[PDB]
Amino acid sequence: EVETFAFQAEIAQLMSLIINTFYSNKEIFLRELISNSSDALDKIRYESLTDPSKLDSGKELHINLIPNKQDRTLTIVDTGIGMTKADLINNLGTIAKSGTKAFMEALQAGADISMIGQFGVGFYSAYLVAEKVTVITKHNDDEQYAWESSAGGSFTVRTDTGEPMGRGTKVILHLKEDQTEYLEERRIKEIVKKHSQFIGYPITLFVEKE
Numbered sequence: 001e002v003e004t005f006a007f008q009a010e011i012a013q014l015m016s017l018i019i020n021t022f023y024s025n026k027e028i029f030l031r032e033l034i035s036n037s038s039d040a041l042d043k044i045r046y047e048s049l050t051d052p053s054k055l056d057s058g059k060e061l062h063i064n065l066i067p068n069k070q071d072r073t074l075t076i077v078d079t080g081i082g083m084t085k086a087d088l089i090n091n092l093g094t095i096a097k098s099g100t101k102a103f104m105e106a107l108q109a110g111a112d113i114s115m116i117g118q119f120g121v122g123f124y125s126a127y128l129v130a131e132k133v134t135v136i137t138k139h140n141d142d143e144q145y146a147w148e149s150s151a152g153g154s155f156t157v158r159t160d161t162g163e164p165m166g167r168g169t170k171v172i173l174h175l176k177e178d179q180t181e182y183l184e185e186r187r188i189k190e191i192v193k194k195h196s197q198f199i200g201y202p203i204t205l206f207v208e209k210e
């Protein structure tokens with residue numbers, strides 16, 4: 001059972017800009033997704049201080065980076081707080097608490113796309129390198145869901161079964177054909193060292209089986 005939703009207009013406009021603006025410094029997408037994971041880990045860390053049972057779904061707080069050249073995917077996995085179904089729909093589908101409006105105004109007034117994280121919309125930088133993004137997520141208060149969008153103004157949400165996570169979020173980037181550099185181990189290492197070296201959780205780069 002798949003539900004289809006329209007992005008809020010301003011989010012569709014933001015996505016279109018990210019997809020269509022000429023901008024070569026695409027590598028910042030990884031910093032933005034890792035920062036979102038770090039925020040999610042901070043949140044479950046804090047909540048678990050006063051309710052240790054919130055870690056029954058996994059004590060380890062970390063980030064995994066999983067390249068797969070066969071599938072042309074890069075996946076960013078965390079064991080953070082995760083998202084409920086409502087969280088997915090509100091947080092990824094609408095302006096919500098973000099600075100979407102301020103960012104689009106800023107770009108008209110001299111800002112550039114690398115500043116996207118200052119405005120709380122770094123997630124959408126995924127579309128610098130991905131033709132499709134799938135978000136698998138599990139919150140302690142809810143079942144596992146899959147959010148998906150290839151932009152074009154809509155996204156889908158469905159329940160996700162058969163491969164349960166304990167808790168957290170997986171952002172699966174189905175890369176554009178000319179963005180496969182982000183599957184290369186030396187490139188990923190370079191970007192993590194350059195932009196994410198102070199993140200306060202372990203970041204493990206998986207090795208490919210092929």
Ligand SMILES: Nc1ncnc2c1ncn2[C@@H]1O[C@H](C(=O)NCCO)[C@@H](O)[C@H]1O
Pocket residue numbers: 036037040078080081082083091092094095096098120121122123124168169
């Ligand atoms: N890795 C993640 N884990 C849990 N929640 C996440 C997440 N990445 C993004 N989110 C949620 O979705 C929001 C988000 O990025 N919305 C898109 C920008 O408006 C975050 O503020 C955050 O609430």
Ligand SMILES: [Mg+2]
Pocket residue numbers: 047054081139140141
């Ligand atoms: Mg919880």
